[PDB]
Symmetry: C3
Amino acid sequence: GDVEKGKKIFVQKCAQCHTVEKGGKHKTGPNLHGLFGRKTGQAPGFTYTDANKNKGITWKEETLMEYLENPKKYIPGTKMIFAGIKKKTEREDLIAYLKKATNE
Amino acid sequence: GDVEKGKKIFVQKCAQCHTVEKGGKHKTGPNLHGLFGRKTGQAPGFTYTDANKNKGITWKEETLMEYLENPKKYIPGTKMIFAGIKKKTEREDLIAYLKKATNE
Amino acid sequence: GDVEKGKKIFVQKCAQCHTVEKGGKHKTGPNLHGLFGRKTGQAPGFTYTDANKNKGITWKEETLMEYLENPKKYIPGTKMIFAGIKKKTEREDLIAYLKKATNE
Ligand code: HEC
Ligand code: HEC
Ligand code: HEC
């Protein structure tokens, strides 16, 4: 595989939601560092859909090749954009900030 | 709730689509200034889905807690990304612009 | 139509995914230069959905007016955000890059 071309593909189609560096930050999507040889939905600090959290497979060339071809087909129920916040604590904190920030 | 903590959440999951400050601009989503105590779909100058426009509830701790847990469940039909432009005149202006810029 | 207003509409609701200038880059969506008088899904260098690729209509005021009011109704199956990579080649390159970058 051509790593050089890979980078460019990532910048145009993935970077908007993903970071790859170690210690990288979470955005719309989880940080991808340490992806290979690891099971789906295990990036620390990120809240996945139950589907991505339980797909159960290990990310590698074969699995990635099939997933990236059609994510929704490989993992029915996965969501690429905001679909809500599960943790009650998280929602509470967000709402606290909102009651303050939107009340200038 | 924790205001600080909530800000990091907003920045990571909401900022790309929402502004909170008074007079702040609409983006993909409506500016959220004066959210609390206001009825759904009432931000001046933003075109909501008929669903969000007519949900008929008032934004507050409880209503927001349920909505943020699962947006589309609370307001079936709500759209997070471009789903079209209702106003005929707006589509006309936009098209006149494209007619100019894409042929230049 | 009012081009000046049209430019404002495009900046707020289209710019994030589309460029218009000749030689413009492809982002989430395809560069739109040369849109008028061309068949759907004909932008060089962009991988459209089979739906957008074969809608078979010519982009003109009449067609755009309908499309812009409700895209998915006009072209069912069309996707506005990442829905997968068709070409096995790109997937291999992307995966080769990830293999390196995510392993820092
Ligand atoms: C935002 C609009 C995204 C774009 C564009 C891309 N991805 Fe993504 N990805 C996104 C989210 C929110 C999620 C999780 C969804 C869920 O169901 O919880 C993901 C997840 C992945 C994963 C799996 C990670 C894991 O299981 O730990 C991979 C491997 C992945 N995304 C890859 C990927 C690539 C390579 C992209 C560009 C081609 C890409 N994504 C774009 C959000 C978004
Ligand atoms: C990203 C979040 C987008 C936004 C916002 C807008 N568009 Fe888009 N558009 C996007 C994609 C990914 C695609 C292709 C979808 C597919 O099925 O492959 C498109 C396509 C168009 C087209 C047709 C291009 C062609 O036939 O060659 C047009 C005419 C178009 N989009 C226009 C457009 C305008 C004017 C927008 C704002 C009002 C707009 N798009 C937003 C992604 C996104
Ligand atoms: C991307 C686009 C987003 C993201 C990532 C978030 N929201 Fe927001 N939001 C968006 C839109 C286009 C709409 C309106 C949808 C429709 O018309 O059906 C909204 C609306 C809200 C609302 C209700 C506003 C109102 O009734 O006046 C709220 C309270 C809201 N969104 C909040 C919100 C928060 C706190 C987010 C982060 C967790 C968030 N959104 C993300 C679009 C988008």
